[PDB]
Amino acid sequence: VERPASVVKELVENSLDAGATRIDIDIERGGAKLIRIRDNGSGIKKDELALALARGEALASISSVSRLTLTSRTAEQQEAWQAYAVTVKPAAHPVGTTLEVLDLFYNTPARRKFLRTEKTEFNHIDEIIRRIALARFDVTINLSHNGKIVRQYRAVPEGGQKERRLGAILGTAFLEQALAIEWQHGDLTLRGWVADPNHTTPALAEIQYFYVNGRMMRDRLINHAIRQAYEDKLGADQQPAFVLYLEISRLVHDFIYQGVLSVLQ
Amino acid sequence: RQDNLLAAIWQDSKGFGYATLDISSGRFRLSEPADRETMAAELQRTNPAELLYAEDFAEMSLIEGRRGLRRRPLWEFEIDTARQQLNLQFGTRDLVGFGVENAPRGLSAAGALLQYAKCTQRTTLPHIRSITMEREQDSIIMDAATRRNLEITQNLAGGAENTLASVLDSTVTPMGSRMLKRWLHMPVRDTRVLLERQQTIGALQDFTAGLQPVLRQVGDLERILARLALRTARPRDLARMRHAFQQLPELRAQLETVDSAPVQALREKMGEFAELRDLLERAIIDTPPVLVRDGGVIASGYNEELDEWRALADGATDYLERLEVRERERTGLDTLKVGFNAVHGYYIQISRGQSHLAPINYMRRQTLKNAERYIIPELKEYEDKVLTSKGKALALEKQLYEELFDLLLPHLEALQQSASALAELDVLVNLAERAYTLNYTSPTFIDKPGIRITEGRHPVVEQVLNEPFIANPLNLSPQRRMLIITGPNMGGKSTYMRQTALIALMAYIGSYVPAQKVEIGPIDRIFTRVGAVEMTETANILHNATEYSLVLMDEIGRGTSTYDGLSLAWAVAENLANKIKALTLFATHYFELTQLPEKMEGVANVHLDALEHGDTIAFMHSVQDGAASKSYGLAVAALAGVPKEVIKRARQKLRELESIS
Amino acid sequence: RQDNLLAAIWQDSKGFGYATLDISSGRFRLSEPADRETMAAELQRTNPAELLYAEDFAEMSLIEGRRGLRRRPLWEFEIDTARQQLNLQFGTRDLVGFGVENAPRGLSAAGALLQYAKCTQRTTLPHIRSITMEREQDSIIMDAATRRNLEITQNLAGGAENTLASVLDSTVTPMGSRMLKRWLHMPVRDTRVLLERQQTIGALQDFTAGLQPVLRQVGDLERILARLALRTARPRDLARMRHAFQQLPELRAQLETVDSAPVQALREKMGEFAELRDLLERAIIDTPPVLVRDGGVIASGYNEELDEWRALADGATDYLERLEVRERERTGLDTLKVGFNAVHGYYIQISRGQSHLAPINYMRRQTLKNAERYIIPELKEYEDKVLTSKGKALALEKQLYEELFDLLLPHLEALQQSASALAELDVLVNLAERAYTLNYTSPTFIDKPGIRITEGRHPVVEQVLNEPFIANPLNLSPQRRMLIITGPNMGGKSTYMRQTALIALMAYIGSYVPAQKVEIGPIDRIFTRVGAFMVEMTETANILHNATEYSLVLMDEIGRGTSTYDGLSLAWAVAENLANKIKALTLFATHYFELTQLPEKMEGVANVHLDALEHGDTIAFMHSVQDGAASKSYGLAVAALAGVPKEVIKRARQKLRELESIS
DNA sequence: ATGCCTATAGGGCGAATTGGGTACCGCTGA
DNA sequence: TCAGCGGTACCCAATTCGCCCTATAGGCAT
Ligand SMILES: Nc1ncnc2c1ncn2[C@@H]1O[C@H](COP(=O)(O)OP(=O)(O)NP(=O)(O)O)[C@@H](O)[C@H]1O
Ligand SMILES: Nc1ncnc2c1ncn2[C@@H]1O[C@H](COP(=O)(O)OP(=O)(O)NP(=O)(O)O)[C@@H](O)[C@H]1O
């Protein structure tokens, strides 16, 4: 977990385990000094906070490397319990778990050398937040760089405008090009949006975030299958631009090609 | 069923001032109707049996159709005597506790009325014990104590950071920032107009992002129109106006798709203004210089004769190049160079070795160290046709530029309306963006006074605070019309009290409110109390506050004892529950007042529960039905930095005090 | 002899930051040495057994000569972690209560030091329960609370009215008002320099009336010099300078008669620059136009070539005499005046009463307030030929106007010195006026800490009040080193408190002090308390740790908290601390009559109170400090005097005696 | 070996920003 | 009245600070 973005990914995964519908991510100095995530999901007990300090083991890993302070209020009316670094004491927070981080590299000057600038690594933090937001429209995500909110991703209810938030996540130009693709072949169920190949910009073509069971998966062959379908529409061969949610493996890929091709054409 | 009512009226250059008195009851009122019809309506409303007017009253037409008229001298309406006489009548050292102190126009009438009252009656009038200011505009009545405490535009320090302004003021244009600021100091209470904003804001929530960039192109058109009216406008000001004119077609298109009749009404108020945009494009260069003084403002193709006088100033470099070439050929001097000098004009410079080899036609103009500069008749003649043509073309530029005011002023009124509408759009679109960003809800207005907040939050404190605000519910009604809020410091007493005040004010700018859900009733006067004086402001709130008024009492009883403050707070809370029944929030440290809910009807015990574990403490920041458990200054003292060694003595001192009580 | 001291140092683009820690005692200090030699001296002074430095520390030469040196990474000196770690160490929610919060440069050192400190000894640090700033400048120490509370330049509201500034600021010249304002924000404590002011002020009290009018002629010469240096000065700015230059002989004459060596030194520093006076008198017209852009600035006879380009303008000058007269005759309007404008050219301005009496030949050019400017073809034709040749005169007039800087820039340094000296003269003549007017006394400075005031008064409150202040004395020494001041609400217990603070501050601007007689000792730090616990006790925490034996403590309405048992208990401990441990000069304005049992408990403390006589519901405050305690509560009696309804007052007195029957 | 990918740091450009310049505001003795 | 006349608020506009970006190398699994 050398990249601050990879740490962010782990903390959001812990917020998804809580089942939080509200995520707020705080970043200081390119995301190195502060990584505060507050969540409204299940609140781990003061005992569950103590063993997580000592998914709990993954929290212990960041606590040893950095001075991670985690405060969680239990569903049972109670003071939230805030575990620094290794001190656990009462705190004020609504029902849920908050995962604050001090300089990620408290004991690693090599990991500081591994940090790439302050903005490019934040752009990597943005990318991770950009990918999980698509997978989970249900959970609100508010992103702030150096304490300045950059992106306002809004929790979408079932039947709500997933496209609006999708448009916010990947930019308006993607949404315009994006054609809603929902293909079900027997048990295999595909839902999402694929950008129109002819007028697709290179930046939209780079955005090809494929989610299998709400987990981001990149396969060159799956890309090649969508790229083939893009090459079938028109002679020019541009990078495939597809955001999809599929529940399924190689026979599927044959019907990811046909399923996408039929909607595209 | 009529009464014998006495009154007075006076005016200055600004507006009108009014006062009344019933000798049967002893009621005394004050007002400042700004316009004529309001003033005529107020005379018509009160209908005084006896009316006073100053010998030099300008707008006599108001009073020449009234009964029991009295012509009074001017000096009687002087504010100096007025303040002095009224202070000694009420026995106060100031009229701040009537909320009339900063209403001198009206106090001229009141001052003249009382001097006349002390002369008409000439008996003891202790049945006159108070005056009150009642400017019952669609605007909320707020003392500057609210505006300095709520930090609407100005924080306690005097800065404009951590304000409700700073938060809501993400407005792209400055004239939007100002209209936002006026709204927040003048909350609209025409429930229809408020709903017109709430429906507008709901519709633009989606389209907010697309409109904002287009609005940032406009700039401060409102202040440009102020310079346009004065005929003192600058070319770059007119460029910003043209840049704004080009956006009106784009905005008319974006707002056409938006489903909201108020938006469609605002879209019509905005206007196409294509003809004014076309004239500015044809006339002015895309980016002209700062002043018209310099010229180079009006683009070629607008005026033929401008381009004629320009054509003289454009036939220059080639003329001198041919001269430079011809004179270099004829004389045989290759260092001969014809250049311009801002001080002396155009010259012919030759190197010092070749300077005295020049012919007899060359007249000495400038002697240099490395050269000798000259002037000749052809240049000197050419120098005249340039210098004059510049000035005449430039003079025509100033005249045309003034003529452009004659073409724009016909629409000036319509441009101000459009500018106000554009400024209003920026505010609305900004508020729609903030509501979209900060997940704000639309509060719906009811008939009876009361605020029902569902998991509501402090709109400013939540933004700048690193930790999330703990959501706070409120249930105010004429049944639960007061809440005794006790607890610790950093309990959230003042936050939950000031969060309620902002919520009301943010609801009464038609903007989406910082809560999950709010249902609010008529709040006509928002009044707040905070330490720098104390008794002065509380009295103004007692005298002015009605059944409908929102009262925000913060620690009444910062006085000179345990009991002076408690006794007063008890009487004030009783008064506002027993007599006035105003919407009152009484956040105080007086746990003794927690015996009011059992004493009074309408009062309810609430507190900010704080649970102390180890030496440190946790404040739930959550409003619970009950009272403060104990003292917390000891717990806070450490959190303020104080050495624990002094607390170990202070806790021991508290233990001795606990044994007594 | 030898100490085991841990220390750290860091610098930014602005200056240096420094911190230390002794593991033997637990003293934890911080500083921001601005310059290099101060920073070298501080390392040399402390002599730490172990010293931290950032890998990218620029000025290494400082630390190449110290022992036990440690090379640390940059990230450790980050303020974010520093604030977080130090908050957790002390258990505070902010470092405002150490008075170091607004010293981030040093807190980088402190932050890096503690992270290292918690790790070097790896022991419990309960003895290290506070950090404190030791200012590299040991002249004066003024926190924001003091400036906002004593109201030196800014009242409680934020206005600059009824301040110590507003009172003392009767300065004739604006550059004097600013030098007065800087002095108040930087009270001098070089006893020599203070006495240099006190001797100057004493000598000028007599000559103040003669000099003030001469100083008012000068105007803000300092801001004119700022524009002259930028080469952006205006003719009417140069006219004020010429007007000021004409006064220098007059000022040199009036200050010559004054017997004060500092005045005679200031008189020599003042200079004359009568050469530069001669230059401007010859160069510029007596009363020139607003801007140089217009021209018509430089008087004829200075530059001949300006006169050659103005040969047309010389013919043009009596052409405007001939057009103004002809048009004054023809129209019949005597207020008709012909003047120049860079934007429009030459115009004909007529007074508003006579504006509409002008003929139809007159075309509207400029509309003004109480005037209407016009244009006619003859003038508009004449305007063109003049604009161009007079333009080459104006370009030369602007070129000669720049050359006026080239003739003034040799003395520019000396003019700034002179301007500062003239500004200083205005301040010290202004103070000499105020002291003469208000019969202020010269306080004499002693070596030991303490203020001995004889019938002293509040310098601001006495001016704004409609009643002559009841002047009262003060006897502060390291024997009588504390006063517990009890009294009524709006009683005026905070006056004698605040009057003491101003007296010290007014004494430390070398100005004559508001009292009959004062003898004052070293007061380096002024620490103040005024209401609005999350804001109030944060200041009280800062005044406790920072305050020394010499520091002047002004706590007002302390313990306004969650009860009468929390506020008292803290107030009791604070009063004990400042009398028992610190033994600091403290002025404790409070309502806690229970604390009146501290003069018998503590050594140094004295009971005082503000006499107030109440008859019925109305009350009179004597505003006179008497040695004792407040008889009872008066908020009832005041409440009516504030205007609160008698229904509340009666119910207050009816509820009072139901509560007073218990206690 | 190696060859397509990838972050990077200096450079370029835009957005805030406070000093600097202008139009405006009383206004002040004469 | 009155003609400057110095002040004063406030709107620019070059400057400063932060943000972006494209050639410039490296880079690491194959
Ligand atoms: N709902 C809240 N959620 C989180 N922090 C809060 C909340 N309300 C108040 N605070 C914190 O409490 C402090 C503000 O004090 P506040 O609660 O407004 O005054 P108080 O309780 O009356 N104390 P005092 O001013 O001394 O009389 C700050 O540290 C806030 O961050
Ligand atoms: N001699 C005096 N005559 C008349 N008024 C005075 C006199 N001395 C002081 N005052 C004023 O009396 C008022 C009382 O002081 P003020 O600060 O308002 O109350 P306090 O009790 O001193 N302060 P506090 O402890 O915070 O309640 C102020 O307006 C003083 O300026």
DSSP track, C529-592 = E-----SHHHHHHHHHHH--SS-EEEEESTT-SSSSSHHHHHHHHHHHHHHHTS--EEEEEBS-
Provide the 10 A C-beta neighbour count for residue B17. 27
Q: Which residue of C93, C563, C582 is the best one to mutate when testing the B interface, meaning the one whose CB has the most B CBs within 10 A?
A: C563
Contact B619 A92 (CB under 8 A): yes
Residues forming a β-bridge with C614: C619
Contact list in A for residue B621 (CB cut-off 8 A) is 92
CB crowding B208-247: b at 16 or more within 10 Å, else e: bbebbebbeebbbbbebbeebbeeebbbbbbbbbbbbbbb
> Would you give the DSSP letter of residue B46?
H
CA distance C197 to C183: 12
Measured in whole angstroms, the distance separating CA B47 from the mean position of its chain's CA atoms is 35
Q: Is B497 in the pocket of ligand 1 (CB under 6 A)?
A: no
How far are the Cα atoms of A40, C287, C289 from residue C368, in angstroms, in the given order?
A: 66, 22, 17
Three-class HEC string of B532-587: CCHHHHHHHHHHHCCCCCEEEEECCCCCCCCHHHHHHHHHHHHHHHHCCCCEEEEE
Q: Is B463 in the pocket of ligand 1 (CB under 6 A)?
A: no
Is residue C620 helix, strand or coil?
strand
Which one, of C609, C527, C608, lies nearest residue C574 by Cα? C527
Here the tokens at position B585 are: 């929030």
Q: Which nucleotide is nearest to C286 (CA to C1')?
A: E4
Q: Which amino acid would we find at residue C564?
A: T
Chain B / chain C CB contacts < 8 angstroms? 248
Determine which residue's CA is closest to atom 27 belonging to ligand 1: B489
Contact C642 B535 (CB under 8 A): yes
> Would you give the DSSP letter of residue C151?
I
Please report the residues numbered 67 through 86 in chain C whose beta carbons come closer than 8 angstroms to any beta carbon of chain A: 73, 75, 78, 80-81, 84
| Radius of gyration for the alpha carbons in chain C, expressed in angstroms and rounded | 33
Which one, of B138, B143, B175, B190, lies nearest residue B34 by Cα? B138
CA distance B14 to B2: 33
Provide the 10 A C-beta neighbour count for residue B625. 10
B159 CB and strand D closer than 7 A: no
In the numeric block, the tokens 């800490």 are attached to: C449
Probe residue for ligand 2, chosen from C495, C528, C626 as the CB with the greatest number of ligand atoms within 8 Å: C495
User: Contact C59/C33 with Cβ under 8 angstroms?
Assistant: no
Is residue B204 helix, strand or coil?
helix
How distant is the Cα of A38 from the closest Cα of chain B, in angstroms?
A: 8
How far are the Cα atoms of B376, B378, B389 from residue B382, in angstroms, in the given order?
A: 10, 6, 11
| Half-sphere CA count of C491, side-chain side, radius 13 A | 35
Contact A92 B618 (CB under 8 A): yes
CA distance C254 to C434: 19
Task: Name chain B's partners: 3 or more CB pairs within 8 A.
Answer: A, C
Order of strands, edge to edge, in the sheet holding B444-445? B444-445, B517-520, B451-456, B472-475
Q: Residues with Cβ < 8 Å from A41, sequence gap 6 or more?
A: A15, A17, A18, A19, A20, A21, A96, A97
CB crowding B165-192: b at 16 or more within 10 Å, else e: bbbbbebbbbbbbbbbbebbbebbbebe
Q: Residues with Cβ < 8 Å from C305, sequence gap 6 or more?
A: C396
Here the tokens at position C594 are: 């229970």
Contact A84 C78 (CB under 8 A): no
> Which residues 367-426 of chain C have a CB under 7 Å from nucleic chain D?
none
B84: alpha, beta or left, given left = phi > 0 and alpha = psi -120 to 50? alpha
CA distance C309 to B26: 81
How far are the Cα atoms of B24, B69, C361, C494 from residue B132, in angstroms, in the given order?
A: 18, 24, 60, 32
CA distance C195 to C370: 55
How distant is the Cα of C374 from the closest Cα of chain A, in angstroms?
A: 57
Domain extent listing, chain A: 4-153, 174-264
Here the tokens at position A1 are: 């977990």
Q: Which amino acid would we find at residue A37?
A: I
CA distance B270 to C412: 56
CA of B460 to the centre of ligand 1 (A): 12
Contact C80 A105 (CB under 8 A): no
Mutual angle of helices B221-230 and B377-437, in 10-degree steps: 140
Contact C343 B292 (CB under 8 A): yes
B307: alpha, beta or left, given left = phi > 0 and alpha = psi -120 to 50? alpha
Residues forming a β-bridge with C373: C349, C366
Q: H helices within B438-548, ranges in order? A: 461-464, 493-507, 534-544
Helix (H) or strand (E) holding B207: helix B191-218
∠ CA C433-C436-C438 to the nearest 5 degrees?
100
User: Closest to B471 (Cβ–Cβ): which among A89, A94, A164?
Assistant: A94
CA distance C245 to B432: 62
Å: C313 CA to D8 C1': 66
Is residue B156 helix, strand or coil?
coil
CA distance C554 to C571: 13
Å: C223 CA to E8 C1': 14
How distant is the Cα of B645 from the closest Cα of chain C, in angstroms?
A: 9
User: Contact B212/B433 with Cβ under 8 angstroms?
Assistant: yes
Q: What are phi and psi of C559, to 5 degrees?
A: 75, 20
> What approach was used to elucidate this structure?
cryo-EM
Q: Residues with Cβ < 8 Å from C489, sequence gap 6 or more?
A: B559, B560, B564, C591, C634, C635, C638
Q: Residues with Cβ < 8 Å from B293, sequence gap 6 or more?
A: C293, C342, C343
Contact list in B for residue A93 (CB cut-off 8 A) is 467-468, 470
Q: Residues with Cβ < 8 Å from C88, sequence gap 6 or more?
A: A84, A87
Is residue C251 helix, strand or coil?
helix
- Establish if B615 touches chain A: CB-CB under 8 angstroms: no
Order of strands, edge to edge, in the sheet holding A140-145? A88-91, A80-83, A69-73, A96-100, A34-39, A22-28, A140-145, A148-153
| Radius of gyration for the alpha carbons in chain B, expressed in angstroms and rounded | 36
Helix (H) or strand (E) holding B185: helix B174-185
> Which residues 342-371 of chain C have a CB under 7 Å from nucleic chain E?
349, 351, 353, 370-371
Contact A91 B618 (CB under 8 A): yes
User: Which residue's CA lies closest to nucleotide E18 at its C1' atom?
Assistant: A119
Q: Which amino acid would we find at residue B3?
A: D
In the numeric block, the tokens 């508020």 are attached to: B431
CA of C423 to the centre of ligand 2 (A): 35
CATH number for region A174-264: 3.30.230.10
Probe residue for ligand 2, chosen from C155, C161, C455, C465 as the CB with the greatest number of ligand atoms within 8 Å: C465
Contact list in B for residue A92 (CB cut-off 8 A) is 467, 470, 618-621
- Establish if C56 touches chain A: CB-CB under 8 angstroms: no
CA distance B206 to B335: 70
Task: Tell me the torsion sign for CA atoms A194, A198, A204, A209.
Answer: positive
Three-class HEC string of chain A: CCCHHHHHHHHHHHHHHHCCCEEEEEEEHHHCCEEEEEECCCCCCHHHHHHHHCCHHHHHHHHHHCCCEEEEECCCCCCEEEECCCCEEEECCCEEEEEECCCCCCCCHHHHHHCCCCCHHHHHHHHHHHHHHHHCCCCEEEEEECCEEEEEECCCCCCCCHHHHHHHHHCHHHHHHEEEEEEEECCEEEEEEEECCCCCCHHHHHCCCEEECCCECCCHHHHHHHHHHHHHHCCCCCCCCEEEEEECCHHHHHHHHHHHHHHHC
Contact A90 B617 (CB under 8 A): yes
CA distance B19 to C132: 59
Which one, of B114, B103, B185, lies nearest residue B152 by Cα? B185
Which one, of C12, C149, C144, lies nearest residue C78 by Cα? C12
Here the tokens at position B24 are: 């049967």
Q: What are phi and psi of A70, to 5 degrees?
A: -115, 120
Residues forming a β-bridge with B452: B475, B519
User: Contact C507/C189 with Cβ under 8 angstroms?
Assistant: no
User: Contact C451/C518 with Cβ under 8 angstroms?
Assistant: yes
User: Contact B300/B310 with Cβ under 8 angstroms?
Assistant: yes
CB crowding A93-109: b at 16 or more within 10 Å, else e: bbbbbbbbbbbbbbeee
Helix (H) or strand (E) holding B651: helix B644-660
Q: Is C641 in the pocket of ligand 2 (CB under 6 A)?
A: no
User: Contact C96/C26 with Cβ under 8 angstroms?
Assistant: no
Here the tokens at position B108 are: 């001229």
In the numeric block, the tokens 């220059």 are attached to: B316
CA distance B440 to B515: 6
User: Contact C447/C522 with Cβ under 8 angstroms?
Assistant: yes
> Would you give the DSSP letter of residue B496?
H
CA distance B246 to B281: 9
How far are the Cα atoms of B3, B509, B565, B589, B618 from residue B626, in angstroms, in the given order?
A: 48, 33, 21, 14, 18
CA distance C223 to A12: 59
Task: Name chain A's partners: 3 or more CB pairs within 8 A.
Answer: B, C
∠ CA C337-C342-C348 to the nearest 5 degrees?
20
- Establish if A102 touches chain C: CB-CB under 8 angstroms: yes
Q: Is C489 in the pocket of ligand 2 (CB under 6 A)?
A: yes
Q: Residues with Cβ < 8 Å from C226, sequence gap 6 or more?
A: none
Q: What are phi and psi of B7, to 5 degrees?
A: -150, 165
User: Contact C79/C30 with Cβ under 8 angstroms?
Assistant: no
How far are the Cα atoms of B103, B524, C546 from residue B133, in angstroms, in the given order?
A: 8, 13, 48
How distant is the Cα of B497 from the closest Cα of chain A, in angstroms?
A: 19
**In chain A, which residue's Cα lies nearest the Cα of B471?**
A94
- Establish if A264 touches chain C: CB-CB under 8 angstroms: no
Q: Residues with Cβ < 8 Å from B586, sequence gap 6 or more?
A: B482, B483, B484, B485, B551, B553, B556, B569, B572, B573, B576, B593
Q: Which amino acid would we find at residue C77?
A: F
C69 CB and strand D closer than 7 A: no
B288 CB and strand E closer than 7 A: no
Q: Residues with Cβ < 8 Å from C46, sequence gap 6 or more?
A: C5, C7, C20
**In chain B, which residue's Cα lies nearest the Cα of A141?**
B437
CATH number for region A4-153: 3.30.565.10
List chain E nucleotides near protein: any atom < 7 Å from a Cβ: 1-7, 10-13, 19-21
Contact B614 A89 (CB under 8 A): yes
Here the tokens at position B65 are: 């159709």
Q: Which nucleotide is nearest to C335 (CA to C1')?
A: E2
CA distance B627 to B485: 8
Q: Walk me through the domains of chain B, giving residue ranges and CATH numbers.
A: 5-120 (3.30.420.110), 171-271+408-437 (1.10.1420.10), 444-630 (3.40.50.300)
CA distance C606 to C473: 14
Residues forming a β-bridge with C200: none
CA distance C438 to C454: 15
B610: alpha, beta or left, given left = phi > 0 and alpha = psi -120 to 50? beta
User: Contact C466/B537 with Cβ under 8 angstroms?
Assistant: no
C271: alpha, beta or left, given left = phi > 0 and alpha = psi -120 to 50? left
Nearest atom of ligand 2 to the alpha carbon of B560: 27
Q: Which residue of C566, C649, C651 is the best one to mutate when testing the B interface, meaning the one whose CB has the most B CBs within 10 A?
A: C566
How far are the Cα atoms of B129, B204, B438, B454, B498 from residue A157, in angstroms, in the given order?
A: 60, 20, 17, 20, 32
User: Contact B509/B432 with Cβ under 8 angstroms?
Assistant: no
B177 appears as a binding residue in the annotation: no
| Radius of gyration for the alpha carbons in chain A, expressed in angstroms and rounded | 20
Q: Is C634 in the pocket of ligand 2 (CB under 6 A)?
A: no
Stated in angstroms to one decimal place, the resolution of this structure is: 5.0
Determine which residue's CA is closest to atom 19 belonging to ligand 2: C490
CA distance C492 to B623: 39
Which one, of C643, C466, C490, lies nearest residue B94 by Cα? C643
Contact C129 B344 (CB under 8 A): no
Residues forming a β-bridge with B20: B7, B29
> Would you give the DSSP letter of residue B158?
S
Q: Which amino acid would we find at residue B631?
A: S
CA distance C248 to C252: 6
CA distance A8 to C552: 51
Q: Is C472 in the pocket of ligand 2 (CB under 6 A)?
A: no
